[PDB]
Design a protein around this ligand. Structure first.
Ligand SMILES: CCCCCCCCCCCCCCCCCC(=O)OC[C@H](COP(=O)([O-])OCC(O)COP(=O)([O-])OC[C@@H](COC(=O)CCCCCCCCCCCCCCCCC)OC(=O)CCCCCCCCCCCCCCCCC)OC(=O)CCCCCCCCCCCCCCCCC
Ligand SMILES: CCCCCCCCCCCCCCCCCC(=O)OC[C@H](COP(=O)([O-])OCC(O)COP(=O)([O-])OC[C@@H](COC(=O)CCCCCCCCCCCCCCCCC)OC(=O)CCCCCCCCCCCCCCCCC)OC(=O)CCCCCCCCCCCCCCCCC
Ligand SMILES: CCCCCCCCCCCCCCCCCC(=O)OC[C@H](COP(=O)([O-])OCC(O)COP(=O)([O-])OC[C@@H](COC(=O)CCCCCCCCCCCCCCCCC)OC(=O)CCCCCCCCCCCCCCCCC)OC(=O)CCCCCCCCCCCCCCCCC
Ligand SMILES: CC(C)=CCC/C(C)=C/CC/C(C)=C/CC/C(C)=C/CC/C(C)=C/CC/C(C)=C/CC/C(C)=C/CC/C(C)=C/CC/C(C)=C/CC1=C(C)C(=O)c2ccccc2C1=O
Ligand SMILES: CC(C)=CCC/C(C)=C\CC/C(C)=C/CC/C(C)=C/CC/C(C)=C/CC/C(C)=C/CC/C(C)=C/CC/C(C)=C/CC/C(C)=C\CC1=C(C)C(=O)c2ccccc2C1=O
Ligand SMILES: CCCCCCCCCCCCCCCC(=O)O[C@H](COC(=O)CCCCCCC[C@@H](C)CCCCCCCCC)COP(=O)(O)O[C@H]1[C@H](O)[C@H](O)[C@H](O)[C@@H](O)[C@@H]1O
Ligand SMILES: CCCCCCCC/C=C\CCCCCCCC(=O)OC[C@H](COP(=O)(O)OCCN)OC(=O)CCCCCCCCCCCCCCC
Ligand code: HEM
Ligand code: HEM
Lengths: 51, 50, 50, 139, 145, 92, 535, 79, 203
């Protein structure tokens, strides 16, 4: 009558599971996350210019 | 809570292919109807009052 | 919208990489000795010609 | 696809009106007659939306009311075989890299690099298109 | 049958689509995130050597503590090779249970050691630290099948 | 369906019982999969030291030295972060 | 009567000698049919082309520094003092029919020889074709690569030229003469005196037509004999074990395809010799110490040494009344590079501990640390190679020359680390992809489940399927997995008529049924052999 | 105007504002429940935690069946 | 692997059942072609601005259009569009080889159009007019040569689709691919009709 869950969710994940996804990513969700991270990196790069 | 737009009808990390289910889509708030069935009548009653 | 994926999911992957690499080669103007583009974002005609 | 077609029909109506009024008010009441840039751009964005809306209307008349278009459509109604959505593929990044090579070759006027980039673009587009059609190796 | 007090609905399939009010959380565990992470690290890879599913049950295990421990172990996904450490502070009780596949791998010898570590830490006043210490000791004791 | 499963018995010979595990590197038994972390830490530290040492040279320039400083600093920061996290058990 | 003549000649051969058993062994020898195993054959064929063109070139080349005024046919260099080597190279280019083509295809064959040696080295290193057995084969192959590098170095330096003579002055003279204890002595022994000594080109000609090519031929013979009698290793597969070679026999298939590959490789080399201009020595005036160009690069195989020279940060030491120039740094760097390359298999075995007799290759993904190290080394080599080209890179791609130099300097410690980390994680993620394919089947198009709106990719299991939908996961066997139903029996039977018109339905059905039967027969034969071996 | 003053202002006002806002916000009780004290009664619902450590046949639920609890020992303690 | 978990005879199939639903590939192609229309709109704007700013004699004295070579090429492009539509009909049927024949002759006629455009380019360059030579020359070359690049892209698409049909069995997926390639070719010939009417007749 009770569920066996983890004390905390997996923090990061096993070595070598994302690098190949990014190259071969075809899930819109992962691509959207790649957009957000990469786009935000350009925000910092472009924002540094304003400073 | 009280979310809508059908993206909240799935696990917070969405399953690959976004869904294991789909609720009855009736209005612009499928997830609100899914989570609060009692409001379904209310959302229609007060809709036009504005 | 309740869909599992975008219409052309290899295409949207190409769109991201075109964005990333297209963006980088624009930033690449800085590493050149002259620098990036002098003309403003608008890049008006006479100031932009060779 | 009635609403999908009607959206583009409305856009076509508005853009045609804008193109016509711009052309008239620029042929007369402008310093040098018709602008010939805004006029052409407005005419051909009217053409853009007109092509899209005409195709959507053709499809709407060709197809019976889909569950998606049908209000009061149950999930089971649309439940069935969705088509082939491409799984993981590393050809998009190669296409982007090839087009970036061609683009830098165009920027830095290097005809050799432009040719190499175009060859790589052809190769990578061929790879992407043939990805799910390259039959098993026949030895 | 009744779903959560508010906002949780049974869906077309078995899964229950639940909601939480915007300001509040879902896990509601009464432990620091870092200590929960440390315990998860233990259970996850400090037990990989044991190759036996290590489980922790902080809930109250009343009546016959041994038997309630037996059935909460049964509730573990793979009780065949599993080691469940149950702590009830409402009863100040520890109970460790093991699967049949977890036999003769040093588990039985490690049982008193793990329970002693847990008890020492608890009397010091650290439930989570005691759980981690017990998990570490038991994992060190247990040998892979 | 037109594919046959593969049976492989490669000769094995460290026994992999210490170091990396299949859960972390699925093909741990199939080849060299573990580089000691000390090796990578010392390599990063020596790379940073080499970058800093290249500042001493016959160049009147200064942006070169600043680039060396920045790259050495980020290398040392990464090495320190990794070492600290592993010391504490991959925390924070 | 060709059949009668062949039978009579066979009887004569088997009477004079008795080669029946040995010849049958050679013909029946089985060679794996993997494409990556033709990479060494590329180098072998390029070497053969090099020999054939080099004989022709030696028939016309005159090695000497004896000064001469051209008085030839090439007008832009007339009355200019030049060495006999340069004069006869110009004569080959202009006043000998097909001489320009022969020398161009020779140089292109040299470039392909180096490139294919490099690619073959990559293949063997990444697939682990050197451990326990074949480690000596790797060692002699490393010696062969070094010899090829220096052979090309002496080759493109053979026609005394402005570019190549400048390269000689840099490397052979400066590096040799900077070496602390014996540097000047080695320089004088090699050059018969000061740098422009009147024996350098004759000595290099000897070294390049007879001495070094003789050693290369001997080492290639040893290499091929070792590969022949230490049966070629193979990738893990259905019927492939550590105690068998699955492939095709020498006579019917392997021999014909190897000969055809040789034909195609020499065709590529000839096409490049025709269409692509290589080393226009006529453009590159005769060597004069006072003259120089801006390019000043060696061939791509020595480009990494030149890039090391460029990038290394001008560190010189001055002991008591002595100098230790920066040339010694690059010399020691090259020594370390070659020592590590030659001694890697022994280094790898000392580190890991594996001395087991390995006959089954391992996919580069299956060995993350070694593929990571190889990627790191290739990244460093590419960094050095482009550092040597920083001059033209800066010129064409508008980047300041100092910026390119310092990009190389910083990268040669940053880029190797980045590539190591990326390659390690990439290999592990390829392993993870293989495991996910094993445990879930191949991916396909999405389907919406009937009762509810669940979306499922509708995978296809690669093994026995459990009573319910999910399959029994398979165990990784060191062999590639099909990640596209494309490559399985799915949508692969187009009308077998022609490109423009169909064929009769009876013929098409016969052909496709026969092909399907052949595929079934091959797969069943592999399956039964695998079962017999492992049971 | 007062080059040093302007530099100090642009470098400090952001820092002062950041410090003030951090004192205001980062020093507020978070939504994470406070650590459970041993003295206090255990009010939270039962918490069973599992490692997810080993491989479990196939991910598919069906076919697992219920072989049995198959107990393999015991232990006890009272702090 | 009993038979297959995905009961499909093609590893790749139509992205949605097109009988009851819109063809996603066709929809995307139509939208992208509508965008390429705006690209050519920018080119047309350039040309029309140059025309407006010309001082009466829009084609300068050195330049002289060759209708003798411009009418055959546009007629050949119209014929190519007709043959492409015939190939589309073949693809709608299961006629793999009929589609291949129609698309091969379409590719040949498109290549003939490209070669004719190149010949007219060579003749024009010889007779003075050049991209740097004059504003008319430059706008004309930009417009018509970007269209020629689009035609070359269509030729590449044709050969690539034909290779795909060779390598895999004909299915609704390949039929739709042929349909969208034909949509691109029809768009190319339509923009060519516009460019011809503008450059040559309207001037
Ligand atoms: C200006 C820049 C030109 C951009 C042109 C590409 C944009 C088109 C995108 C919208 C078209 C519909 C679509 O979704 O594309 C499907 C597809 C995306 O595949 P997906 O996302 O995985 O989904 C499966 C498909 O929906 C399943 O459908 P499919 O895979 O079967 O697609 C069918 C046709 C899809 O229909 C088309 O895209 C029509 C092709 C017209 C493009 C011709 C280029 C014109 C520009 C030249 C002047 C500049 O595919 C083909 O078989 C023909 C492709 C031929 C492309 C030739 C491009 C070569 C450019 C170099 C030319 C050299 C001359 C210049 C010097 O996109 C492509 O194949 C085009 C590749 C992108 C090329 C970018 C070049 C940089
Ligand atoms: C840092 C991160 C940013 C990197 C930016 C650079 C991005 C581009 C490089 C990545 C492209 C290749 C890739 O993603 O890895 C696929 C591949 C893994 O494929 P897989 O699906 O998992 O294979 C499983 C089975 O083998 C069976 O799987 P399969 O059925 O799919 O077949 C094997 C797959 C595997 O094929 C390959 O591995 C081909 C590798 C292509 C490398 C292209 C280098 C571009 C230079 C980038 C510079 C960095 O299939 C093939 O396509 C074999 C045919 C070979 C086609 C060669 C096409 C050359 C296209 C040139 C276009 C012009 C582009 C110029 C720009 O990754 C590799 O093994 C290569 C390592 C990455 C290359 C480093 C380049 C330096
Ligand atoms: C130069 C570069 C160009 C490329 C040349 C390299 C080619 C190498 C491929 C090897 C193929 C080979 O030798 O097959 C021959 C092979 C000899 O070996 P086998 O017959 O298997 O004997 C049993 C095993 O050898 C017993 O060996 P095992 O399997 O028990 O393993 C022991 C193995 C241990 O493994 C090794 O260590 C082998 C590696 C040898 C190391 C370096 C030696 C090679 C140095 C070459 C330098 C060239 C310069 O030791 C050896 O077998 C060493 C044999 C050395 C021969 C190397 C040939 C080169 O059989 C033949 O003799 C067949 C050809 C018959 C010729 C007669 C035809 C008709 C006669 C007409 C005459 C005139 C007509 C007028 C009327
Ligand atoms: C030692 C060292 C590496 C110093 C750093 C200098 C350097 C190489 C910088 C990069 C060069 C580039 C890519 C310049 C373009 C501007 C730039 C930096 C843009 C941003 C780069 C970036 C991350 C872009 C994102 C997408 C991406 C990966 C784009 C890459 C684009 C390119 C140029 C790809 C090809 C790489 C390439 C060929 C670089 C030049 C290297 C060489 C040695 C070319 C040799 C070569 C030359 C030089 C000829 O002139 C020539 C003339 C006629 C026929 C043949 C050739 C020929 O083969
Ligand atoms: C203006 C001017 C002078 C122009 C000319 C340029 C010039 C100077 C020279 C080039 C001119 C020439 C002569 C070019 C052609 C070179 C040549 C001999 C090409 C042969 C290819 C050809 C014509 C094939 C025809 C198609 C056909 C029927 C092929 C099957 C029958 C044939 C020819 C089989 C040949 C088999 C073959 C390549 C034997 C090579 C012998 C050698 C050296 C090694 C054999 C060998 C091989 C090949 C391995 O791969 C191997 C792998 C692992 C372990 C051991 C071995 C091993 O021992
Ligand atoms: C199996 C072998 C296959 C090989 C096929 C061979 C291809 C043949 C190419 C075309 C014929 C060559 C004619 C020889 C006459 C000739 O040399 O060709 C020049 C052109 O040259 C250029 O620009 C480049 C033009 C672009 C097209 C050719 C590019 C081919 C490359 C891509 C093939 C090699 C592979 C390289 C891959 C690299 C990519 C890496 C990713 C043309 O004159 P021009 O243009 O005026 O030369 C200027 C001087 O005058 C002036 O001083 C000087 O300043 C310059 O401006 C010079 O250009
Ligand atoms: C472009 C890149 C540069 C070119 C790269 C090519 C050069 C070769 C590459 C890498 C060499 C370094 C490898 C890493 C060495 C590992 C060190 C260690 O800590 O030892 C652990 C091992 C595992 O033992 P285990 O029972 O599995 O226990 C698991 C414990 N966690 O022990 C041992 O057997 C071995 C101990 C001694 C090893 C000595 C190896 C080097 C010999 C001198 C050759 C020069 C090296 C040049 C380095 C660049
Ligand atoms: C002149 C240079 C070279 C020639 C002619 C050559 C030729 C060959 C050939 C034809 C093979 C068998 C086919 C194959 O494995 O691809 C082979 C195998 C091999 N080569 Fe070389 N190669 C050369 C350079 C090198 C280098 C630089 C190394 C290091 C090396 C090490 C090896 C090893 C270890 C093998 C055994 C591979 C196996 O058994 O599968 N070779 N070589
Ligand atoms: C073994 C590998 C060999 C390599 C990598 C190699 C490489 C080269 C290269 C790159 C050149 C420059 C050609 C030019 O600049 O036009 C050259 C020249 C030459 N090679 Fe070799 N070669 C090899 C073997 C041989 C052999 C076996 C011979 C004689 C049979 C030979 C004879 C010559 C001659 C005479 C020249 C001078 C041609 C000239 O000055 O244009 N080479 N070599």
């Amino acid at each position: 009558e009770l569920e066996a869950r983890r004390p905390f969710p997996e923090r990061m994940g096993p070595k070598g599971n994302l690098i190949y996804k990014l190259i071969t990513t075809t899930d819109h969700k992962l691509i959207g996350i790649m957009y957000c991270v990469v786009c935000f990196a350009f925000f910092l790069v472009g924002g540094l210019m304003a400073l | 809570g009280y979310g809508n737009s059908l993206e909240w009808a799935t696990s917070c990390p969405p399953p690959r292919h976004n869904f294991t289910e789909l609720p009855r889509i009736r209005s612009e708030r499928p997830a609100f109807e899914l989570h609060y069935p009692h409001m379904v009548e209310r959302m229609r009653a007060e809709a036009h009052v504005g | 919208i309740g869909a599992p994926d975008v219409a052309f999911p290899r295409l949207n992957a190409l769109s991201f990489w075109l964005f990333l690499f297209g963006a980088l080669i624009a930033i690449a103007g800085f590493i050149t000795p002259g620098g990036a583009a002098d003309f403003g974002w608008t890049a008006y005609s006479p100031l932009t010609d060779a | 696809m009635h609403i999908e077609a009607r959206l583009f029909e409305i856009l076509t109506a508005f853009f045609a009106l804008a193109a016509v009024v711009y052309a008239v008010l620029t042929a007369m009441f402008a310093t040098g007659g018709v602008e010939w840039a805004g006029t052409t751009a407005l005419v051909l964005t009217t053409g853009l939306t007109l092509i899209t809306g005409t195709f959507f209307r053709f499809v709407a008349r060709r197809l019976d009311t889909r569950p998606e278009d049908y209000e009061d459509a149950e999930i089971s109604d649309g439940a069935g075989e969705l088509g082939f959505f491409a799984p993981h593929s590393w050809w998009p990044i190669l296409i982007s890299l090839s087009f970036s090579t061609a683009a830098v070759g165009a920027a830095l006027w290097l005809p050799w690099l432009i040719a190499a980039g175009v060859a790589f673009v052809i190769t990578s587009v061929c790879g992407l298109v043939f990805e799910y059609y390259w039959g098993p190796e026949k030895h | 049958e009744l779903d959560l007090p508010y906002g949780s609905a049974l869906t077309s399939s078995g899964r229950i689509s639940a909601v939480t009010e915007p300001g509040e959380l879902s896990v509601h565990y009464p432990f620091p995130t870092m200590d929960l992470v440390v315990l998860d690290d233990a259970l996850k890879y400090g037990s990989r050597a044991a190759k036996a599913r290590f489980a922790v049950y902080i809930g109250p295990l009343g009546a016959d503590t041994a038997a309630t421990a037996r059935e909460i172990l049964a509730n573990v996904p793979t009780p065949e090779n599993a080691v469940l450490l149950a702590v009830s502070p409402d009863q100040r009780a520890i109970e460790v249970v093991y699967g049949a596949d977890v036999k003769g791998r040093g588990i039985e010898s490690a049982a008193p050691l793990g329970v002693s570590a847990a008890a020492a830490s608890f009397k010091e006043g650290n439930l989570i630290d005691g759980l981690i210490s017990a998990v570490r000791v038991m994992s060190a004791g247990v040998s892979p099948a | 369906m037109s594919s046959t499963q593969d049976r492989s018995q490669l000769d094995p010979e460290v026994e992999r019982h210490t170091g990396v595990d299949v859960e972390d590197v699925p093909s741990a038994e199939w080849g060299w999969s573990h580089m000691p972390i000390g090796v990578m830490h010392i390599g990063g530290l020596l790379s940073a030291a080499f970058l800093l040492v290249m500042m001493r040279g016959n160049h009147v320039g200064h942006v070169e030295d600043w680039f060396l400083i920045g790259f050495a600093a980020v290398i040392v920061a990464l090495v320190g972060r990794n070492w600290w996290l592993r010391r504490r058990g991959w925390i924070r | 009567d060709f059949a009668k003549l062949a039978a009579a000649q066979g009887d004569a051969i088997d009477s004079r000698y008795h080669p029946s058993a040995a010849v049958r062994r050679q013909l029946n020898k089985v060679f794996p049919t993997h494409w990556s195993f033709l990479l060494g054959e590329i180098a072998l064929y390029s070497f053969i082309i090099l020999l054939l063109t080099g004989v022709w070139l030696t028939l016309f080349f005159d090695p000497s520094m004896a000064h001469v005024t051209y008085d030839g046919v090439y007008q832009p260099l007339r009355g200019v003092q030049m060495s006999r080597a340069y004069e006869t190279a110009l004569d080959i280019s202009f006043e000998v029919r097909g001489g320009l083509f022969v020398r161009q295809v020779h140089h292109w064959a040299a470039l392909m020889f180096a490139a294919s040696i490099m690619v073959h080295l990559a293949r063997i290193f990444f697939t682990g074709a050197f451990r326990r057995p074949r480690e000596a084969n790797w060692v002699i192959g490393s010696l062969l690569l070094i010899l090829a590098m220096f052979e090309g170095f002496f080759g493109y330096s053979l026609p005394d030229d402005l570019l190549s003579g400048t390269g000689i002055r840099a490397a052979l003279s400066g590096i040799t003469m900077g070496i602390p204890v014996i540097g000047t002595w080695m320089h004088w022994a090699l050059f018969g005196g000061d740098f422009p000594g009147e024996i350098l080109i004759p000595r290099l000609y000897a070294l390049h037509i007879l001495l070094i090519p003789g050693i290369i031929l001997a080492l290639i013979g040893a290499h091929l004999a070792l590969v022949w009698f230490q049966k070629h290793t193979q990738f893990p597969g259905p019927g492939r074990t550590e105690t068998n070679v699955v492939g095709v026999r020498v006579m019917p298939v392997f021999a014909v395809k190897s000969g055809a590959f040789f034909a195609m490789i020499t065709g590529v080399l000839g096409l490049m010799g025709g269409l692509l201009t290589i080393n226009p020595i006529w453009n590159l005036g005769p060597y004069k110490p006072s003259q120089v160009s801006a390019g000043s690069q060696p061939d791509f195989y020595m480009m990494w040494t030149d890039g090391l020279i460029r990038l290394w940060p001008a560190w010189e030491f001055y002991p008591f009344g002595h100098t230790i120039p920066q040339g010694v740094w690059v010399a020691v760097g090259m020594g370390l590079v070659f020592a590590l390359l030659i001694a890697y298999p022994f280094i790898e075995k000392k580190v890991t501990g594996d001395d087991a007799h390995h006959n089954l290759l391992q996919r580069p993904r299956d060995v993350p640390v070694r593929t990571a190290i190889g990627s790191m080394a290739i990244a460093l080599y590419l960094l050095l190679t482009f550092a040597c080209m920083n001059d033209i890179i800066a010129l064409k791609f508008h980047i300041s020359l100092n910026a390119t130099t310092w990009i190389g300097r910083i990268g040669m410690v940053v880029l190797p680390a980045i590539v190591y980390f990326v390659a390690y994680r990439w290999a592990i993620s390829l392993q993870r992809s293989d495991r996910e394919v094993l445990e879930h089947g191949v991916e396909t198009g999405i389907i919406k489940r009937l009762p509810h709106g669940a979306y499922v990719e509708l995978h296809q299991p690669l093994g026995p399927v459990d009573e319910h939908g999910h399959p029994i996961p398979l165990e990784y066997a060191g062999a590639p997995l099909p990640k596209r139903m494309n490559k399985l029996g799915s949508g692969g039977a187009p009308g077998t008529g022609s490109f423009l018109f169909p064929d009769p339905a009876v013929e098409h059905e016969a052909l496709t049924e026969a092909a399907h039967a052949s595929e079934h027969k091959s797969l069943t034969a592999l399956k039964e052999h695998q079962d017999r071996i492992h049971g | 105007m007062s080059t040093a003053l302007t530099h100090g202002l642009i470098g400090g006002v952001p820092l002062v504002l950041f410090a003030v806002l951090a004192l205001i916000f980062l020093t507020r009780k978070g939504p994470h429940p406070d650590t459970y004290k041993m003295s206090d009664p255990w009010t939270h619902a039962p918490i069973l935690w599992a490692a997810e450590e080993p491989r479990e046949h196939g991910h598919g639920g069906h076919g697992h069946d219920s072989h049995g609890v198959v107990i393999g020992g015991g232990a006890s303690g009272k702090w | 692997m009993t038979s297959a978990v995905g009961t499909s005879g093609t590893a790749i199939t139509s992205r949605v059942h097109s009988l009851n639903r819109p063809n996603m590939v066709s929809v995307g192609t139509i939208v992208w072609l509508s965008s390429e229309l705006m690209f050519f709109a920018g080119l047309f704007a350039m040309y029309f601005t140059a025309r407006a700013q010309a001082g009466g004699a829009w084609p300068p004295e050195p330049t002289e259009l060759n209708l003798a070579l411009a009418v055959p090429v546009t007629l050949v492009l119209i014929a190519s569009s007709f043959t492409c539509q015939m190939g589309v009909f073949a693809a709608e049927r299961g006629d793999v080889f009929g589609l291949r024949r129609w698309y091969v002759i379409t590719f040949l006629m498109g290549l003939f159009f490209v070669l004719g455009q190149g010949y007219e380019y060579i003749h024009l360059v010889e007779h003075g007019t050049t991209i740097p030579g004059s504003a008319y020359g430059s706008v004309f070359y930009l417009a018509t040569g970007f269209h020629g690049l689009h035609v070359i892209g269509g030729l590449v698409a044709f050969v690539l689709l034909l290779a795909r049909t060779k390598m895999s069995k004909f299915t609704p997926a390949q039929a739709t691919a042929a349909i969208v390639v034909s949509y691109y070719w029809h768009f190319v010939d339509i923009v060519w009709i516009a460019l011809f009417a503008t450059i040559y007749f309207v001037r």
